[PDB]
Amino acid sequence: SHMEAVQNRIVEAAERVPGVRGVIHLRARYVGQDIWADMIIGVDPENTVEQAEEICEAVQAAVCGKIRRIESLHVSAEAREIGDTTKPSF
Amino acid sequence: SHMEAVQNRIVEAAERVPGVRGVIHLRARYVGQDIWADMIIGVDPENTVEQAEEICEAVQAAVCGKIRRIESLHVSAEAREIGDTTKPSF
Numbered sequence A, B: 001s002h003m004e005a006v007q008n009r010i011v012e013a014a015e016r017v018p019g020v021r022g023v024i025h026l027r028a029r030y031v032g033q034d035i036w037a038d039m040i041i042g043v044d045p046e047n048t049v050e051q052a053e054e055i056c057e058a059v060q061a062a063v064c065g066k067i068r069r070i071e072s073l074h075v076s077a078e079a080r081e082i083g084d085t086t087k088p089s090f
């Protein structure tokens, strides 16, 4: 579907960013022709919150830069341990 | 309003939890008689993501325990520096 393809592009762009350990949560909607989205990435649990927020900002910039129809994107982080099977992923 | 009072109770419960530096984002809806909500707390930027996630889990437990109609609550964290005016708050 339309949304599924957009979500796939968001996930691909985010996962290229240094420090990203997968996308854990992602929701998006159209508002008219534009996309509004909210996403949560995994990051190294030993990162500081400060470090994680820099990664989030980099993801925001990357995703917004690659996908023109996204009007609004919020990115936040949660822990994701290497070989984590306890959290969802995209 | 109905939702405003519920949101006020969520914020009060969350802000009592050790390590919480304010609620930055909160959205909630009714699904039938039950509430579904998503919230983002501020935490010390020097906390590890691991530490921040323990705070989030404590907030989840606290809020769910105080407000019976909440069926589903997701809690995540962002940085909030002391005397921060750069992020919204409740």
Ligand SMILES: [Zn+2]
Binding pocket: A074, B024, B025, B040, B078
């Ligand atoms: Zn935010």
Ligand SMILES: [Zn+2]
Binding pocket: A024, A025, A040, A078, B074
């Ligand atoms: Zn989560």
